[PDB]
Amino acid sequence: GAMGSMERASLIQKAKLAEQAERYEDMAAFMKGAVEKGEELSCEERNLLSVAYKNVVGGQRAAWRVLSSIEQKSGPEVREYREKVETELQGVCDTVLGLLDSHLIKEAGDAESRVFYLKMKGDYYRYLAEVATGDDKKRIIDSARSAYQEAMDISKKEMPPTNPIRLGLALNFSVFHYEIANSPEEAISLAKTTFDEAMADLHTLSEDSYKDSTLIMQLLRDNLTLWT
Amino acid sequence: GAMGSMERASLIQKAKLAEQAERYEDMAAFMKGAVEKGEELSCEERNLLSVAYKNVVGGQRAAWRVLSSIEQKSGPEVREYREKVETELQGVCDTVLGLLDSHLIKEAGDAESRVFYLKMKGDYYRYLAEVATGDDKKRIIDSARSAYQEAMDISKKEMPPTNPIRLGLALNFSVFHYEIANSPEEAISLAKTTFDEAMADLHTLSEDSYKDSTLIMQLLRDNLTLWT
Amino acid sequence: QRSTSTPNVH
Amino acid sequence: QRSTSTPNVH
Ligand SMILES: *CC(=O)NCC1CCN(S(=O)(=O)c2ccc(C(F)(F)F)c(F)c2)CC1
Numbered sequence: 090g091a092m093g094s095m096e097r098a099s100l101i102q103k104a105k106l107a108e109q110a111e112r113y114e115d116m117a118a119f120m121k122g123a124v125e126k127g128e129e130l131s132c133e134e135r136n137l138l139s140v141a142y143k144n145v146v147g148g149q150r151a152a153w154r155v156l157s158s159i160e161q162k163s164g165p166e167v168r169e170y171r172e173k174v175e176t177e178l179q180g181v182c183d184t185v186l187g188l189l190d191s192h193l194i195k196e197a198g199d200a201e202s203r204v205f206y207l208k209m210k211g212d213y214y215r216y217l218a219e220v221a222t223g224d225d226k227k228r229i230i231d232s233a234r235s236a237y238q239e240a241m242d243i244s245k246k247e248m249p250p251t252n253p254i255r256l257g258l259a260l261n262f263s264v265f266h267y268e269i270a271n272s273p274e275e276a277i278s279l280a281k282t283t284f285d286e287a288m289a290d291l292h293t294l295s296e297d298s299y300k301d302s303t304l305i306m307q308l309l310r311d312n313l314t315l316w317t
Numbered sequence: 318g319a320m321g322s323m324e325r326a327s328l329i330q331k332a333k334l335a336e337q338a339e340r341y342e343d344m345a346a347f348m349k350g351a352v353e354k355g356e357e358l359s360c361e362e363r364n365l366l367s368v369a370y371k372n373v374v375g376g377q378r379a380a381w382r383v384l385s386s387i388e389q390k391s392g393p394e395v396r397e398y399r400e401k402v403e404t405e406l407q408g409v410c411d412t413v414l415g416l417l418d419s420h421l422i423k424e425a426g427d428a429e430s431r432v433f434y435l436k437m438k439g440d441y442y443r444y445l446a447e448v449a450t451g452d453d454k455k456r457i458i459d460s461a462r463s464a465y466q467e468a469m470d471i472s473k474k475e476m477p478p479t480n481p482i483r484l485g486l487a488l489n490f491s492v493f494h495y496e497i498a499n500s501p502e503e504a505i506s507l508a509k510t511t512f513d514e515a516m517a518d519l520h521t522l523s524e525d526s527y528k529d530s531t532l533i534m535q536l537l538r539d540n541l542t543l544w545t
Numbered sequence: 546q547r548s549t550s551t552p553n554v555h
Numbered sequence: 556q557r558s559t560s561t562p563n564v565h
């Protein structure tokens with residue numbers, strides 16, 4: 090790859106510069122290079138990888154929704170341009186999923202790390218499901234559900250109910266239920282038990298991550314208000 | 318080019334979709350294609366071209382200033398990454414300047430259009446001067462000054478003092494004086510006479526552009542307050 | 546309003 | 556504060 094000649098530490102350092110410069114494509118390229126050195130990622134490095142690709146794919150999703158709305162509210166130009174953005178978004182999702190499957194998801198390592206990568210697999214299949222249609226679609230929805238569910242099982246076994254990976258996973262799985270799988274009840278049921286169990290075991294908040302935890306709890310509460 | 322097979326009207330229509338989707342690289346590519354059909358641009362199309370490339374180059378300039386500050390406040394990684402962003406910014410400026418010289422700046426046409434393209438030439442040489450150093454630098458500063466000055470002469474001859482191209486040009490020329498040429502007095506003198514002459518001939522505000530005019534007048538006043 | 550998912554913050 | 560130039564708005 091383009092990054093193959095650069096030392097892993099320099100790739101990590103440049104990803105941090107790119108984050109500061111808000112060059113998120115560059116940051117994602119740097120972290121792809123770092124992953125491809127074949128060593129596992131630390132929590133800080135996982136955060137870099139997450140932030141980079143989510144920023145890239147988030148702008149693609151927002152563009153896609155703008156074009157998709159113009160297309161629905163209606164020449165071939167809008168469909169053509171929407172299809173171009175769609176194709177680029179699927180390319181980024183395939184890249185992330187390839188990294189997860191080629192390099193990041195392994196049998197061992199941190200349960201923290203295993204849950205995060207499985208959640209990230211679920212997320213990027215969900216982003217593909219937002220733009221999918223045919224035989225592609227139910228296939229994609231099932232890979233998303235499967236990855237989320239495997240992450241759920243590990244997280245409930247190995248992490249306290251306020252842990253931010255566990256919380257963010259449960260929040261995202263419930264969005265999958267509501268927006269992708271058309272299961273409003275499951276989404277409400279998961280978000281409720283997730284919030285309630287976090288509160289019941291509030292004492293497990295961690296000194297170095299409690300602000301992340303309480304933020305997700307609030308977002309769960311926001312979805313429940315919107316869904317009820 | 319990549320756009321050569323697409324009709325000019327479809328390129329314009331897709332540039333407008335890209336603006337709405339905030340895909341400004343795409344929008345700039347579409348407008349480059351449209352320029353390369355070799356017909357002149359209308360005011361609306363010129364606005365598309367201006368907005369697209371300014372958005373692309375503005376994010377590059379902001380990234381460059383972030384990296385450049387980290388570099389000054391201090392391994393080869395920061396310089397290397399700053400040089401990569403610099404090179405990309407110069408590539409975008411060379412592209413704009415090539416379009417202006419190959420296609421857009423002509424002897425005839427709208428004095429409105431001639432002033433705008435000469436101003437745009439001055440701007441993108443100024444963006445190159447922000448990152449230049451050697452024999453490159455004074456050469457670049459002189460091309461910027463020359464293009465601005467030619468635009469000034471035409472604008473004072475052919476446009477009322479509230480016209481927004483005339484105003485925006487004068488505002489940008491005065492920034493060149495202050496930030497690039499190290500001429501604080503010229504910058505203050507130009508901004509003052511520009512504001513005062515706009516106010517003295519306030520009756521020339523146009524129904525379809527007066528909000529642009531009054532916005533530039535305020536920005537002139539802001540620079541004068543900062544510079545005094 | 547779309548549902549809210551995990552935000553892209555630190 | 557840097558000087559302000561023509562903004563990129565309509
Ligand atoms: C130790 C470790 O793995 N750290 C890196 C990852 C932590 C979990 N997240 S996440 O689940 O995507 C996530 C992202 C944002 C937030 C917050 F704070 F709410 F904004 C969160 F709680 C969880 C990825 C990095």
Ligand SMILES: *CC(=O)NCC1CCN(S(=O)(=O)c2ccc(C(F)(F)F)c(F)c2)CC1
Nearest residue numbers: 360363364367481482485529532562564565
């Ligand atoms: C008729 C015509 O040429 N229209 C398009 C151009 C007008 C001038 N500008 S500009 O000089 O770059 C400019 C940009 C923004 C503003 C405003 F409104 F203040 F934000 C302005 F006054 C002038 C380019 C498009």
Ligand SMILES: [Cl-]
Nearest residue numbers: 169170173331
């Ligand atoms: Cl297209």
Ligand SMILES: [Cl-]
Nearest residue numbers: 241242243246
């Ligand atoms: Cl189990």
Ligand SMILES: [Cl-]
Nearest residue numbers: 103397398401
């Ligand atoms: Cl680099």
Ligand SMILES: [Cl-]
Nearest residue numbers: 469470471474
């Ligand atoms: Cl003259």
Ligand SMILES: [Mg+2]
Nearest residue numbers: 095096097126
């Ligand atoms: Mg290495």
Ligand SMILES: [Mg+2]
Nearest residue numbers: 161162163164
């Ligand atoms: Mg019809």
Ligand SMILES: [Mg+2]
Nearest residue numbers: 172173175176
């Ligand atoms: Mg398609």
Ligand SMILES: [Mg+2]
Nearest residue numbers: 323324325354
């Ligand atoms: Mg044509």
Ligand SMILES: [Mg+2]
Nearest residue numbers: 389390391392
């Ligand atoms: Mg030292």
Ligand SMILES: [Mg+2]
Nearest residue numbers: 400401403404
């Ligand atoms: Mg260089």
